[PDB]
């Protein structure tokens, strides 16, 4: 009774409004320019026209939802930062001093920090959605139970839908989590039928001479858990983490609202792969931002069939890249709304 | 009385190495893994080296759009009627063009400059008109060397005046029916490429390649001489864009490139004074066929993959957001 079932939310994800997109195409073709000369900006304006949650290409209010959680696989020595940095950096987000904070402010976007599994108590100014104090160590077992993954998907999609009802027009995703590039690489390996050696990157400056150990840990996580690559919830629960689940839920909720959601980098690619496995109709609500510098970025993007607009060599995460692409969503709508056709 | 071009160029200095070293230290100390903001960090460092800037203050931005018609229109190589240059220039004044709405969204001004439209004087447009269109580069030079040099001076002087008026970031754009043909000619000459590689089965494409080949063969420009190439196989809009780059570099201020046409102007600008290159900021990867070769010779990698080919400065407007974001990161991110 309290919340909608996952199945019910998924069934509200509609294909894009093809008739709206056709009208938008005709309008863009008639504008003061050679046909198709604004390329992917035109494509973006048409894609947004198909999203029934929007009205008149009005996208003023934007909100990047940052999902924070700790990971049991930190115990395997795959991250160089102290584990406590997840908590401190979440507090730093409240202070407004992190990279996503200043880039979101520069883009006029809100930032909503959500605790879905930090190894800490409740944090002032951080939304309490905490499933547990850190995920299970994926190298020795599952990150979480299937039911925990499903319930968190429902909770984070529900939050997103509440924000949609409250007037948010464009979502973005980010995360915070020491060692979370290890589950992300495991998910990408499983979803793309890739050997982990192809998908495992340096994350937060993991020493290149120790990268073989990070590969070994991811390989062991997949061997131990044997996730079903066709089952997005199973992959999330077995070799994912709470932040990854939360980002998938935001994508599901935005698509269910009929609204755009802007991806970030490698971590968000893993969540996007799981979201599209759960409901393929989510893909057309996704807007890529930048091409992450993570080693497995190109493999993940190829399988999503998405081409990011920004090539910034970025690898911070937090949603900082999603913030940058917000300007492009603005630009597509500004071109659609304000550009002349036959003013004289 | 006007300054000489040489006197303007003398002001162009290499980037401030110590300032860039201090910027690198500051960025490494921010609350993030070292180097994790990648090219956004190196953009903030490049801006730290530009002595015309202070405190990564980049509030005021200006895209200067150079409009001119081209004699090689006579060879039938343009995709649209010649009058489009004039009509689009008037649409700029009204603020309804692509660059206008994108610049507004980026908080940049647009300055539309007539350097050679085939028309009477146009209201709302800056009158820098050398002539009613350039010479037909297929049959002879676009302009005399003196014409190119005097327009470089005028356009650099205008840019320097805008710098003194408070503009912190420049961008360039152009309007000009048939101007991808001189652009391809310049890129071919500057990069030692056959025009087939720089011109973008069809009868029209075959003819356009032949026209570019003929322009180079007729004019035999000296590829080592950026002014000679501009004068012989360029055009007034291309000269003006080069002049904006020279003036911005002389002021020590960044200038954001647009697409294929601006790459040709940038290649000429760097032939004229190599130190200009460090003040260039690429924007998007133009979908024009010869874009990659031109960018490779400039050793620039654009940030935006938009599949755009409109021109007019529209790509420069989009990159203004990245200049803004780099400075916001540098100025506002927390440290210890
Ligand atoms: Cl090992």
Curated annotation (Swiss-Prot), chain B:
Q: Which domain of life is it from?
A: Bacteria
Say if the entry is tagged with keyword ATP-binding.
Answer: no
Transmembrane feature ranges: none
SUPFAM superfamilies (alphabetical): Nicotinate mononucleotide:5,6-dimethylbenzimidazole phosphoribosyltransferase (CobT) (SSF52733)
Q: Look up the EC number in the record and give it.
A: 2.4.2.21
Q: Does the keyword ATP-binding apply?
A: no
The pathway noted for it is: Nucleoside biosynthesis; alpha-ribazole biosynthesis; alpha-ribazole from 5,6-dimethylbenzimidazole: step 1/2
Give this protein's Gene Ontology molecular function annotations. nicotinate-nucleotide-dimethylbenzimidazole phosphoribosyltransferase activity
The catalysed reaction is:
5,6-dimethylbenzimidazole + nicotinate beta-D-ribonucleotide = alpha-ribazole 5'-phosphate + nicotinate + H(+)
Q: Which UniProt keywords apply?
A: Cobalamin biosynthesis, Glycosyltransferase, Transferase
Q: What class of enzyme is it?
A: transferase
Instruction: Report the active site residues.
Output: 312 (proton acceptor)
Q: What does this protein do?
A: Catalyzes the synthesis of alpha-ribazole-5'-phosphate from nicotinate mononucleotide (NAMN) and 5,6-dimethylbenzimidazole (DMB).
What HAMAP family does its record include? CobT
| Protein family membership | Belongs to the CobT family.
Q: What is this protein called?
A: Nicotinate-nucleotide--dimethylbenzimidazole phosphoribosyltransferase
Native source species: Yersinia enterocolitica serotype O:8 / biotype 1B (strain NCTC 13174 / 8081)
Q: Which gene encodes it?
A: cobT
């Amino acid at each position: 009774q309290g919340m909608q079932t996952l199945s019910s939310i998924l069934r509200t994800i509609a294909p894009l409004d093809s008739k709206a997109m056709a009208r938008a195409t005709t309008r863009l073709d008639g504008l003061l320019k050679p046909q198709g000369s604004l390329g992917r900006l035109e494509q973006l304006a048409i894609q947004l026209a198909g999203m029934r949650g929007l009205y008149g290409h009005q996208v003023d209010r934007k909100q990047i939802i940052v999902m924070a959680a700790d990971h049991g696989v930190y115990d395997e020595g795959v991250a160089i930062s102290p584990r406590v940095v997840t908590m401190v950096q979440a507090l730093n987000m409240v202070r407004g001093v992190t990279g996503v904070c200043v880039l979101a402010a520069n883009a006029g976007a809100e930032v909503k920090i959500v605790d879905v599994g930090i190894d800490s108590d409740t944090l002032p100014g951080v939304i309490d959605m905490k499933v547990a104090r850190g995920s299970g160590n994926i190298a020795r077992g599952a990150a979480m139970t299937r039911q925990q993954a499903e319930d968190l998907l429902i909770a984070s999609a529900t939050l997103t839908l509440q924000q949609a009802a409250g007037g948010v027009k464009v979502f973005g995703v980010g995360e915070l989590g020491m060692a979370n590039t290890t589950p992300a690489a495991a998910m990408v390996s499983v979803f793309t039928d890739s050997d982990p050696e192809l998908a495992v990157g340096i994350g937060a400056n993991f020493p290149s001479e120790q990268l073989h150990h990070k590969v070994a840990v991811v390989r062991r996580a997949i061997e131990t858990n044997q996730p079903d690559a066709s089952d997005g919830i199973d992959v999330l629960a077995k070799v994912g983490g709470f932040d990854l689940v939360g980002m998938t839920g935001v994508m599901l909720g935005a698509a269910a609202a009929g609204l755009p959601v802007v991806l970030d980098g490698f971590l968000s690619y893993a969540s996007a792969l799981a979201a599209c496995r759960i409901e393929a109709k989510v893909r057309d609500y996704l807007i890529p931002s930048h091409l992450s510098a993570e080693k497995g970025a190109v493999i993940a993007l190829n399988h999503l069939q998405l081409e990011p607009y920004l090539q910034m060599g970025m690898r911070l995460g937090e949603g900082s890249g999603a913030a940058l692409a917000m300007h492009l969503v603005d630009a597509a709508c500004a071109m659609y709304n304000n550009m002349g056709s036959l003013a004289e």
